[PDB]
Amino acid sequence: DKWEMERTDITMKHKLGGGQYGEVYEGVWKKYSLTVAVKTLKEDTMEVEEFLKEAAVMKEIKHPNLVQLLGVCTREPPFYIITEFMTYGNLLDYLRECNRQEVNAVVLLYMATQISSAMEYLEKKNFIHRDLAARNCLVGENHLVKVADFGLSRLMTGDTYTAHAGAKFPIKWTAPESLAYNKFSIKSDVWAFGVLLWEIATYGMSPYPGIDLSQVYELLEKDYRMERPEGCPEKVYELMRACWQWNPSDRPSFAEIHQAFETMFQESSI
Ligand SMILES: COc1cc(Nc2c(C#N)cnc3cc(OCCCN4CCN(C)CC4)c(OC)cc23)c(Cl)cc1Cl
């Protein structure tokens, strides 16, 4: 298959975390002397189908702000997904721990711009991401941000993907139509992206603070939305609000979102 490699080609270095879809390691791809991230699957389990689903999809994708697949090991346990190493880890912990004088307003714009660029790409390729949130974005040197892409679905025929009944979603990031009917689309991602913008603007606060999960849907029904975070530019909140339109069709495209952030980033850098 050519994405296939010898498991003996990697040496494991440190556990970084995991559970999960599988546990995650810092590793070294020996013949390139290259630090890499390795997702692992101990034995066969029920979650093996999950695994190669990710693997398959990640091969179909290439973008500067999408985590680059390097190789896979899928002939027998253990199982390896191998990606580039995102040095600073996830964006949520990053925002929370950063030096805000360094990671300032111009930088937050840069990060929104980078993410929206990735999502514009997925929009065109007819992909949806099932879990857009700060925790699923990764950070490298110099405020480089990439969206993690193990949880992607290709739209094979049409507009909306339907998740299996009984599926649990991260309530606070999830579009109304997704919570209600289990339907995901690129416009559901646009909604989630709105939440992501709020996380970025607040340096990683939890969305709908103190609000009871079980009541979020009802609130959204009655046009309750999160308020403008402190220091968030009015235009940025306007976009947030556009992302959170009740009708999917009323929400902007990622092409529009990216264009808008590109413009704001150019002006901020001037
Ligand atoms: C390869 O397979 C997969 C791997 C992943 N997950 C990761 C990808 C990817 N992709 C890339 N890069 C990662 C870097 C990580 O931490 C590196 C440094 C952390 N530190 C925090 C403390 N300080 C300050 C030093 C830095 C990390 O930690 C858990 C997970 C990463 C996913 Cl989500 C899915 C699949 Cl399929």
Residue numbers in the entry: 233 to 502
Copy the relevant paper text:
Chronic myeloid leukemia (CML) is the result of the constitutive kinase activity of the tyrosine kinase BCR-Abl, the product of the bcr-abl gene fusion present on the Philadelphia chromosomes of patients with CML. Bosutinib is a second-generation dual Abl/Src inhibitor that exhibits potent growth inhibition of CML cells in vitro, is active against multiple imatinib-resistant BCR-Abl mutations and has demonstrated efficacy in ongoing clinical trials for imatinib-resistant CML. In the course of studies of electrostatic interactions in the ATP-binding sites of several kinases, briefly outlined at the end of this report, we determined the crystal structure of the kinase domain of Abl bound to bosutinib at 2.4 angstrom resolution. The structure explains the effects of imatinib resistance mutations on bosutinib binding, and provides a basis for interpreting spectroscopic measurements that probe the environment of the ATP-binding site of Abl and other kinases.
Crystals of Abl kinase domain bound to the compound from Tocris Bioscience were obtained in the same crystal form, and we solved the structure to a resolution of 2.4 angstroms. Anomalous difference maps calculated using the phases from the refined molecular model show strong peaks (greater than 4 standard deviations above the mean) for the chlorine atoms of the drug in the ortho and para positions on the aniline ring, confirming the identity of the compound. Bosutinib occupies the ATP-binding site of Abl, sandwiched between the N-terminal and C-terminal lobes of the kinase. The only hydrogen bond formed between bosutinib and Abl is between the quinoline N1 nitrogen atom and the backbone amide of M318 (a residue in the hinge region of the kinase), a characteristic feature of the binding mode of this class of inhibitors. The 2,4-dichloro-5-methoxy aniline fragment of bosutinib is oriented at a ∼65° angle to the plane of the quinoline heterocycle and fills a hydrophobic pocket formed by residues projecting from the N-lobe into the ATP-binding site. The sidechain of T315 is completely enveloped by bosutinib, making extensive van der Waals contacts with both the nitrile group and the 5-methoxy group of the aniline ring. The nitrile group is also in van der Waals contact with the sidechain of V299. Both the T315I and V299L mutations would result in steric clashes with bosutinib, explaining why these mutations confer resistance to bosutinib. In our structure of Abl bound to bosutinib two residues at the tip of the P-loop (Q252 and Y253) are poorly ordered, but the remainder of the loop adopts an extended conformation similar to the β-hairpin observed in a substrate complex of Abl and makes no contacts with bosutinib. In our structure of Abl bound to bosutinib, the DFG motif is in an inactive DFG-Out conformation, but this conformation is distinct from the DFG-Out conformation observed in complex with imatinib.
